[PDB]
Amino acid sequence: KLNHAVFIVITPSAIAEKYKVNLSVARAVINHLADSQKLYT
Amino acid sequence: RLLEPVPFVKTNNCIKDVDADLFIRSYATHLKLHNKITYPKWCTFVKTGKGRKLAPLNEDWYFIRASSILRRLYLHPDIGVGFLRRQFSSKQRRGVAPNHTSLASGKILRSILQQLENLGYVEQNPKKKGRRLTTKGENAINNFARYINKKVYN
Amino acid sequence: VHPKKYGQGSRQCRVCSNKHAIIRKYNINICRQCFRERADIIGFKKYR
Amino acid sequence: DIKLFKKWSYEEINIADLSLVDCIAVSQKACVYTPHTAGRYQKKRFRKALCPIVERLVNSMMMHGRNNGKKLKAIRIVAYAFEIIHLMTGENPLQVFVNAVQKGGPREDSTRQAVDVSPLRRVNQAIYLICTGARNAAFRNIKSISECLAEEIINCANESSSSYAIKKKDEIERVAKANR
Amino acid sequence: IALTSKNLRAIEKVCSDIMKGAKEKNLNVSGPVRLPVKTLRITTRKSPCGEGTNTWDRFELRIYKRLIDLYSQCEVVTQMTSINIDPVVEVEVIITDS
Amino acid sequence: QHILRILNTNVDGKEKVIIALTAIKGIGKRMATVICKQANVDPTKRAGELTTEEIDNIVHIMSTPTQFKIPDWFLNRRKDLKEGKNIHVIANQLDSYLREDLERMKKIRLHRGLRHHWGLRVRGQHTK
Amino acid sequence: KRVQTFGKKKTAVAVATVTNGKGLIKLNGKNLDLVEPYILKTKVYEPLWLIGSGKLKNLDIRIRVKGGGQTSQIYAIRQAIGKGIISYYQKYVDESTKKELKDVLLRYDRSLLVGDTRRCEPKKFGGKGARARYQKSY
RNA sequence: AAUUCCGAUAACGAACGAGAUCUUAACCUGCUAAUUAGCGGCGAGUACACUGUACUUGCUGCUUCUUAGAGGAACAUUGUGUGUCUAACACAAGGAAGUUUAAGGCAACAACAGGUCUGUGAUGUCCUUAGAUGAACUAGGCUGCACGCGUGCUACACUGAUAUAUAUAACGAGUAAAAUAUGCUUGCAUACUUUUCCUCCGCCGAAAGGCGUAGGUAAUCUUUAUCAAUAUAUAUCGUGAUGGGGAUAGAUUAUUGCAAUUAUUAAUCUUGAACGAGGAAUGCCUAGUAAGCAUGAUUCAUCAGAUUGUGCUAACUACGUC
């Protein structure tokens, strides 16, 4: 069951693991951090 | 990503010398920006084809459809509406019944083709049976293709 | 009488007058059992 | 000279149980830039040895129900899995794979009195165990397959109970030891 | 002339005979044009009735078409062809000025 | 914020707005999507960022949607054979109308009504 | 001058035209990179990497691919480039050099030189598959 | 592989079957051939470079590739092991090909009271024949449903769904009724047109679909240097019976037909059931197969979840034992 939320390795799973976030929110964090699967920075 | 090292000599003289998607997205974006071709308003309430069985759900798609059609016209120089309907066909889950491919909606296609034709990009003729590409469009497509190739490459 | 010029009762085997099992491919109009009796002389030979 | 995906060197190995190096057979004529070589592998019994060990891993990984024949996605998953491996731990991925096969294979088993496991069979069983472990992990489980495959390869290479393959090998080896 | 048949060997015999016949008289033929073979295939259930295993046999009627375009007076080439054919070979007119 | 209850439950709030909108009626999704675009609540956001005014606008659009650009064919509950002509009638009213139609069928009598009253499917499943 | 040859894997056919030029390579009207799957891309670049970049710099290559699906086309292209390079050196360049080149290609793989001849086993009645059967039950 | 051979041997010699024959598919003849196939030759432009590349209209040596005729090619060839060292096998090499190259087709003797007179004007006898079991017309029904058993289809999601984009397939298959005018009176009767099959294409239609036209009796037009879907790439969800799942129902406008209600079929909106990988049991399968994904054809006035073909995507595991 979900218990992940809005607010407080660059894979979506790693971000979800570290900060306890849903994977769309994990993606949102990745996009913020940076500034299907593909080559990494 | 888009750039990779190459072991042969590229030409960069045509749409045939550049990948479909980058050319298509940029041309679609440019077309909307310029405002040459309309949305049109009724087009937001309908689907691309019956294999979708859902809203198109992506906003800027009409310009993309036009952009792909225009590219297809350079690729294949004489075609009509049926070719487009067949091109944009995909699979339809019929619920319990098996899948079949199902043709794209012909009004939206017919309208795009007509708007391009009005703007001098494409041309209905008897010498070559259907729609072909025509000269203002041919020059523009070729030139825009060069402009993109240089801009992307370095 | 009230025939129809379409559907199952409209047609029948050229040789035997059975209404069932008729080959209409290539417009043969023969039922398959009858077709097996004739299949060599018509030219529809077996091979593979 | 030649390199896997342009990324992994393949000029270095450890010697394993010696048998396994002969079987897995990473060498110049078995090297190729990418997985996907569909040459005749069912010519005779031994022929599986000549089939590249990476090629074998992709073929096994592609296997299961809905995912059958979708070989390019399976290849994509292994390429990403090696890239994940390279970042997550300090070694060359090609080496990590060699370590996983060297640890991973079960060496003894029972049909009626345990008997020794042949080395070609041991390699196949290890590859199967690694992929089956990845599959068991993957289903409904949120974490992506490339990462899940990567976790099995590193854990097997390490030797751990966070690998299915080592656990299964332990189970096989114990039952055989106990029976016999 | 255009030659259509369901006998390969008969068509072949006709082909050689008109080829020899023409070449005596120096006539212009454009060398035997073999058209793609068309087969009429019928896929037939065995047994007139259902019982026993479902067993099918696949029938093939293979038709041969061959083509020669020719510049000459019609009458001699058709007369040479028509007398030399076996009736299993169906002959159709084709003619050119070069 | 999050955890809203509208006409019916809509507790969606980490969830995307459009799917949250589906959770009433318009689970067919097209109706919900066109209403969302016409209302002009934006699909991008999560449902905990809905404005109350935007929700009211959605009710306004949903109410008789012929007057926007939403097509008559696209609209549900069309001819509804009577002297009048109708529109999609939403939620418990929609259920009430469906129930009403079944009640009318039982009085009217023909085979579909009779099968329905009996408890037997419309097209047949082939119960053999 | 020019030589023309082919490659054939499954129902694909890829014609290779090897002419005097500069190192320009097209696939129908379109440049060589534009074939899509990145993994199988490397397979078609593979003969260029085995032979270095100098040998193609004297020659322009044109390719026409018809028939077969995705995997089949890639192998047919790979095969056709092989057959093309070696055949051009036998008519025009030098037989010893060609033999050396052929040795390099053969030493890597025979699949490049001569296509795999596997093709379909026909469907046979009594089941959807080629050999597979309907489920029997008692 | 084989009462296949060898070998032994009161039998020696045979014959049918089997192999063999035949049809495909597999490779080579720079020989045989060019149409409704390609390839160049060459004029001409449109586009870009830069001392060719891309793209369209007109004329016209080459045959590698498209097609299809004839003919070649493997016999276990050579080498190495095992084998009465006999028939032969095993391995390696060579080779387009090495399990008689892969697949089919064909089907001995003797049977079964197996199946079929609901395929037949093949057919015995027995029944029936104007209140017919003949011919024929109208409805109803074969599909109904406390419930039991088969074969398939569709699922149970993230190696996924949803939405855009890109790539790309093979076998094929295609021609006594319709409509306009006149006489009688929209009814009836007659003439004339050119009507039923594939639909390109142009217009109109959300979609279904429509209208207008054009070529095709077909390597020529539908249509094929491209008609599929799994491909793959980029986005959107983010594991939650969830946006999975599409059963079920409700409302529509179309389309075929004399007739669509027991919803023929079609689309459109809405409606959102079981189902968390399946007990006991039991099926199929060894290489371009299995699986997955499609699609052509057969029936067809209309109706594929069927059958039969055909491809694409290309695994696992041996390679044996009773």
From TrEMBL, chain A:
Top-level taxon: Eukaryota
Protein family according to the UniProt entry: Belongs to the eukaryotic ribosomal protein eS25 family.
Protein name: 40S ribosomal protein S25
Included range, full protein: 35 to 102 of 105
TrEMBL record, chain C:
Gene Ontology molecular functions: structural constituent of ribosome; zinc ion binding
Gene Ontology terms: biological process: cytoplasmic translation
Protein name: 40S ribosomal protein S29, putative
UniProt xrefs under InterPro entries: Ribosomal_uS14 (IPR001209), Ribosomal_uS14_CS (IPR018271), RIbosomal_uS14_euk_arc (IPR039744), Ribosomal_uS14_sf (IPR043140)
Family (UniProt): Belongs to the universal ribosomal protein uS14 family.
Gene3D superfamilies in the cross-refs: 30s Ribosomal Protein S14, Chain N
Any Pfam family matching the protein: Ribosomal_S14
Keyword annotations: Metal-binding, Ribonucleoprotein, Ribosomal protein, Zinc
Cofactor: Zn(2+)
Keyword Phosphoprotein: no
Binding sites annotated in the UniProt record for Zn(2+): 13, 16, 31, 34
GO CC annotation: cytosolic small ribosomal subunit
Ranges that cross the membrane: none
The UniProt record lists the keyword Nucleotide-binding: no
Entry-linked NCBIfam families: PRK05766.1
Automatic annotation (TrEMBL), chain D:
Pfam family, one: Ribosomal_S7
KW Ribonucleoprotein (keyword) present: yes
A Gene Ontology biological process term: translation
One Gene Ontology molecular-function label: mRNA binding
Record key words, sorted: Ribonucleoprotein, Ribosomal protein
Any one of the GO CC terms: ribosome
Domain Small ribosomal subunit protein uS7: 32-180
InterPro entries: Ribosomal_uS7, Ribosomal_uS7_CS, Ribosomal_uS7_dom, Ribosomal_uS7_dom_sf, Ribosomal_uS7_euk/arc
NCBIfam families referenced in this protein's UniProt entry, alphabetically: PRK04027.1, uS7_euk_arch
Family: Belongs to the universal ribosomal protein uS7 family.
PANTHER family for this protein: RIBOSOMAL PROTEIN S7 (PTHR11205)
Listed name of the protein: 40S ribosomal protein S5, putative
Annotated source species: Plasmodium falciparum (isolate 3D7)
Organismal lineage: Eukaryota, Sar, Alveolata, Apicomplexa, Aconoidasida
Automatic annotation (TrEMBL), chain E:
Domain Small ribosomal subunit protein uS10 residue range list: 1-94
Organism domain of life: Eukaryota
Keyword terms, alphabetized: Ribonucleoprotein, Ribosomal protein
Keyword Cell inner membrane among UniProt keywords: no
GO cellular component labels: cytosolic small ribosomal subunit
GO terms classed as biological process: translation
Record-level Gene Ontology MF annotations: structural constituent of ribosome
Coiled coil: none
Similarity-based family: Belongs to the universal ribosomal protein uS10 family.
Protein name, as recorded: Small ribosomal subunit protein uS10
